[PDB]
């Protein structure tokens, strides 16, 4: 039943929420990436391995821009001719009508026609 | 036209080259139909000009494409009497397939081709 996943979810939720909550700060944007918050202990006094996740818990400290998806949006991609095939084609889509067109094209024109 | 007269704008070869150039779809036979066009004597006052650039030749893959170019040629007006309607209908349709604008003529039109089929 999709309720249990609903109130599946919605425990998680309130887990992490109490989680960080007791951890003191206020939201999760502020500790993605502050990994010094983290810290290596033993296994037992009966293992005796060496284990060492160091190699892990360093981090390259950022500067200006943040350690998160500060932008929003898609990264557009420059577009090819079939754009200006669109404002020619204005009829097809306003009434529904054929049209024949011709056009020069190069090697440096990727996956033409794609938006019309 | 007659053979002994002197010459005209639109001769017998001039149009079957024409003819068969359109229906073949080859512009080979087109081109042949311009030398054999601009290949005669004086005509008209157009004629004795002649072009005269100081540029350099460039690659003919820069310059503007067919279609921005065919969305300036109109035909002019024709008269819905004087003609059948089969002929002005397929000037129209074919005109209004590739952009390019038609004419109505003098004798308006009939109202029942207002929207398409």
């Keep these: 039943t999709p309720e249990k996943v609903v109130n599946l979810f919605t425990f998680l939720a ?3 929420r109490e989680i960080l909550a007791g951890l003191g700060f206020r939201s999760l944007n502020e500790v993605i990436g502050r990994t010094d918050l983290l810290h290596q202990v033993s296994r037992g006094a009966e293992h005796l ?4 996740l160091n190699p ?4 390259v400290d950022p500067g200006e821009n943040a350690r998160y998806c500060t932008l929003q949006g ?3 991609v420059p577009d090819t001719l079939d754009a200006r095939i669109v404002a020619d084609a204005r009829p097809l889509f306003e009434e529904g009508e054929k049209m024949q067109l011709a056009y020069n094209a190069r090697n440096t024109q990727r996956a033409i026609g794609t938006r019309l | 036209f007659r053979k002994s007269g002197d010459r005209h704008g639109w001769e017998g070869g001039v149009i079957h080259t024409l003819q068969q150039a359109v229906t073949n779809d080859s512009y080979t036979t087109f081109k042949k139909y311009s030398e054999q066009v601009n290949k005669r004597p004086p005509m008209q006052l157009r ?11 460039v690659p003919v893959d820069e310059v503007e494409s067919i279609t921005a170019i065919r969305k300036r040629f109109i035909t002019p007006g024709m008269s819905m009497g ?3 309607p089969e002929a002005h209908g397929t000037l ?4 209004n397939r590739i952009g390019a604008k038609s004419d109505s003529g003098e004798g308006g ?6 929207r398409p089929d």
Excluded: G, I
């Excluded at chain 2, 004629?47 to 030749?57: C, F, G, N, Q």
């Excluded at chain 2, 129209?92 to 005109?95: D, G, S, T």
């Excluded at chain 2, 039109?109 to 207002?114: G, I, L, S, Y």
């Design chain 2, 82 to 84: 004087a003609l059948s």
């Design chain 1, 49 to 52: 391995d060496d284990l060492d």
């Design chain 1, 74 to 76: 898609r990264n557009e």
């Design chain 2, 109 to 114: 039109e009939d109202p029942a081709r207002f």
């Design chain 1, 14 to 16: 309130e887990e992490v």
């Design chain 2, 92 to 95: 129209n349709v074919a005109m």
């Design chain 1, 56 to 59: 892990r818990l360093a981090q």
């Design chain 2, 47 to 57: 004629d004795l000009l002649e072009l005269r650039s100081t540029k350099a030749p």
